[PDB]
Point group: C2
Chain length 212, copies 2
């Protein structure tokens, strides 16, 4: 009757990264794996200590959740620890992950979504600039030849800047019109290319045409 | 009952060029126009002289065929003459071009086809190299990371070269297999992208993915 807030995450055309924050270290590895190292400063060591580790496969299906050196934690090295044969207590999959853990998997999904938002899926060179539709399919930016730039998120909204940055008309609603016209073309093509996609071959990321 | 050998030519994503030969000067202009300047050396001027001009629109539909300065001809300048208001004797379109002219239009079509063959439509970065499917849709070349290269035309056939160039097996039929696998992917995508294509927006040329 009750399911988890977010659908299973995925690394598709996502590059290896490592984002550091004040509560966890989130990492995407070459195998496409997601590794979250949650943090708690314990005075016993007088520094930040990994408190829990959450690991998710490259398709959000397989999950490992544990809390190493229970009560002492770990030294933050540059990269997360390597995968050791998991207990099986701490092994779950998406369709069974107990509610008490959902929040962490959610952290991972939010992270992957963020990297999804900063990752180009489609690049269109229009007659006015460089369209770039991200892997989130809801983020979009245009880099006009003139120097104007347009941004679009499903959250912060719209922020068209001219050569100096203005919001406000005449110049704007020309730009905006192009923006959406460009946006339709990029989503339309992502959807068009989903057809030619196989398991062994990839269609994205993709760059289309050039400037004059 | 009888039609012309070739279907109407077209400049799609074709760049401005000028190919020189021993009988004509073929040119593709920015407007997408095709201009053939046929040649005859007349001793009267003791040099090559344009004998006839053939001009074809960017969709092989509209044709202009004439023979300037009848009996004397023209000095070969760097570019063809500009379009003057045509007589209308020398104005035709595809569906009426009289047989006596077909051969020239054919020259133009062959030229445009040649440039079509040297023009990239799709670029795939596979796991083994750089696939490149030309605008002819029958020409294809792979540039493997190793240094092997594969070629394919509908005419001269097949010529797979290794790091030194060999034909002949073991290494070959690995390569060839990839070649066709790559080839299927590129044609499949051109056809997939034909759907997202509009009049105001373009889908080609296109480059897909990167190397590791």
């Amino acid at each position: 009757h009750m399911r988890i807030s977010v659908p299973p995450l995925n690394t598709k055309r996502l590059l290896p990264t490592r984002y550091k924050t004040k509560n966890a270290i989130m990492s995407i590895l070459r195998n496409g794996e997601v590794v979250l190292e949650f943090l708690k400063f314990r005075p016993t060591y007088n520094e930040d200590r990994i408190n829990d580790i959450c690991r998710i496969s490259d398709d959000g299906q397989r999950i490992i959740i544990y809390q190493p050196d229970p009560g002492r934690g770990l030294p933050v090295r540059e990269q997360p620890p390597d995968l050791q044969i998991p207990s099986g207590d701490c092994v779950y999959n998406y369709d069974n992950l107990p509610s008490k853990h959902w929040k962490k998997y959610i952290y991972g999904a939010r992270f992957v979504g963020l990297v999804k938002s900063k990752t180009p899926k489609v690049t269109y060179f229009s007659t006015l600039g460089k369209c770039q539709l991200m892997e989130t399919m809801t983020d979009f930016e245009i880099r006009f030849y003139s120097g104007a730039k347009l941004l679009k998120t499903p959250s912060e909204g719209l922020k068209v800047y001219d050569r100096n940055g203005m919001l406000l008309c005449s110049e704007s609603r020309s730009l905006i019109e192009h923006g959406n016209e460009c946006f339709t073309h990029c989503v339309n093509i992502s959807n068009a290319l989903e057809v030619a996609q196989t398991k062994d071959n990839s269609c994205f990321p993709v760059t289309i045409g050039r400037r004059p």
